[PDB]
């Protein structure tokens, strides 16, 4: 996943 990292976000519908 990717929710615990700061990776993710609302500009990347690719990440969680």
Same mark, same amino acid.
């Given at each position: 996943? +990717? =929710?615990? &990292?700061?990776? +993710?976000?609302? &500009?990347?519908?690719?990440? =969680?």
């Amino acid at each position: 996943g +990717a =929710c615990s &990292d700061p990776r +993710a976000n609302y &500009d990347h519908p690719e990440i =969680c």
